[PDB]
């Protein structure tokens, strides 16, 4: 497949320069990579500058990945393993010489880099937000009344999942404490005890609510049985009276 | 390439394999780790991420994807966008766990271009964490037993409430098909009184 993005366009190219420079400046690139950046510098790229920009721009994707010698081969491997779709239009020798005419594509490649970073952050916090949900929303599920067996089963499953998550967090804290040549599980034990106390309080509140609901349901069942007996008697009497009145009216008319 | 010193010692492959099979896993066979490949290694990342803290990958991937995978905009590159997001967030969550267990050199090439040495070091970290977690579970099984007892009590209470509701919903009548109440009884009494008055008037007329 061909390249649909108009990299050869001029006003588009200037716009790409614009937001690329804005993003690069807003992350304090000039200080962290100790390399000054200018619109003119991006207009006329160089081997060292392009390599440094690509290195910084990828390290935002995978901070744990370290670079080494043979920069061109590493860039090609990175581009391959990023599931890049337009790679059949790129070549290793072109990567080795960024500044040529082929640069009219290469800078736009960096653009997609930046875009992923932007997309990355919409994902990033949400992962923590997911855990945040497990911190709060499930608790709300434990604080709501139950009207069906499926709801009770879901609440029990949520409580079990919360207990498992608390145990996993305590184990992780204990492992972190034990990593630094020490055996200090006291903070982990305190956290586990606090989590167990919170779970016990939630379970007790749920049990009290269920018991109150059951008592109310039993009282309503007794009242409903009495009312049903009374209503059946009243309905039988009303039907008999209506039949008698209809018969009397038919006889008199 | 990033590299750090590890607190855990280097461990050889065979009892690693057998203990990984014994503890929770079944795909951690001898030949599977003996031959490093992308698919098996990323799948193993999946089983472990569902193992130690117990929430599925697909839920997290969808719950991080929905904002770009839906119809905010029509641009075609959305599918490659989301695929890159998938691989990067898998890298990122695996990096969280591996820096949580003392590995600060792990990366994305570990996911997709694995090699024996780093994979076996990661597996040694995995087994040490699994053994420590097993010890913690053995020490804190009292909390698990208490939680199980609480769940059983809650299930019993829910069953009692359901039985009470079923008993309550067992009352019905022609007047009061929505379970008997005071309003239906009052309406029936009023109708019966009117019919009785009419019948008494007719009887007096025909007396």
């Amino acid at each position: 497949n061909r390249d649909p993005r108009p990299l050869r366009d001029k006003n588009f190219q200037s716009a790409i320069q614009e937001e690329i420079y804005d993003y690069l400046k807003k992350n304090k690139f000039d200080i962290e990579t100790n390399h000054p950046i200018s619109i003119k510098f991006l207009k006329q790229p160089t081997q060292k500058g392009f390599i440094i920009i690509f290195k910084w721009l990828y390290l935002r994707l995978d901070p744990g990945y370290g670079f080494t010698k043979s920069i061109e081969n590493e860039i090609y491997q990175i581009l391959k393993n990023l599931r890049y779709p337009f790679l059949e239009s790129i070549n290793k020798s072109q990567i080795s010489a960024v500044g040529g005419s082929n640069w009219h594509k290469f800078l736009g490649m960096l653009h997609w880099m930046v875009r992923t970073n932007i997309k990355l952050d919409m994902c990033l916090n949400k992962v923590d937000r997911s855990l945040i949900n497990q911190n709060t929303q499930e608790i709300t599920i434990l604080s709501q009344p139950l009207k069906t067996l499926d709801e009770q089963d879901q609440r029990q499953e949520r409580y079990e999942l919360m207990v498992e998550k608390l145990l996993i967090d305590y184990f992780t804290e204990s492992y972190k404490s034990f990593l630094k040549l020490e055996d200090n599980y006291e903070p982990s034990m305190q956290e586990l005890k606090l989590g167990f106390e919170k779970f016990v309080h939630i379970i007790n509140t749920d049990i009290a609510n269920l018991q109150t609901q059951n008592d109310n349901l039993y009282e309503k069942y007794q009242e409903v049985m009495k009312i049903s007996q009374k209503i059946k008697t009243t309905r039988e009497k009303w039907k008999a009276l209506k039949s008698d009145s209809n018969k009397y009216e038919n006889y008199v008319n | 390439m990033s590299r750090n010193q590890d607190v855990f010692p280097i461990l050889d492959l065979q009892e690693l394999v057998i203990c990984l099979q014994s503890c929770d896993f079944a795909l951690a066979t001898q030949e599977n780790i003996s031959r490093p490949t992308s698919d098996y290694m990323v799948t193993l990342y999946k089983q472990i991420i569902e193992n130690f803290m117990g929430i599925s990958v697909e839920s997290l991937l969808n719950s991080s994807n929905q904002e770009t995978g839906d119809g905010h905009l029509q641009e075609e590159n959305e599918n490659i966008y989301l695929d890159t997001l998938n691989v990067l967030v898998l890298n990122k969550i695996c990096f969280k766990f591996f820096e949580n267990i003392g590995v600060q050199d792990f990366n994305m090439t570990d996911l997709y271009k694995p090699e024996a040495q780093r994979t076996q070091r990661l597996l040694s970290a995995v087994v040490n964490y699994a053994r420590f977690r097993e010890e913690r579970m053995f020490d804190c099984n009292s909390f698990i037993l208490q939680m199980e007892s609480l769940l059983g009590q809650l299930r019993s209470k829910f069953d009692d409430y359901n039985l009470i509701q079923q008993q309550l919903k067992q009352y019905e009548d022609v007047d009061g098909d929505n379970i008997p109440d005071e309003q239906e009884l009052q309406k029936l009494e009023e109708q019966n009184k009117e019919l009785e008055i009419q019948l008494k008037k007719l009887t007096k007329i025909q007396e």
């Binding site: 996993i168 | 855990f8 579970m137």
Partner: peptide, 29 residues
């Protein structure tokens, strides 16, 4: 998967030819 980790651990309890973890300072610090 409905296999609870806590329930599975309790069932197993009620090292698999191994040891209760280890911690040794690496020589090549």
């Amino acid at each position: 998967r409905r296999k609870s980790i806590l329930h599975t651990i309790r069932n197993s309890i009620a090292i698999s030819l191994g040891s209760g973890a280890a911690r040794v300072v690496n020589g090549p610090v």
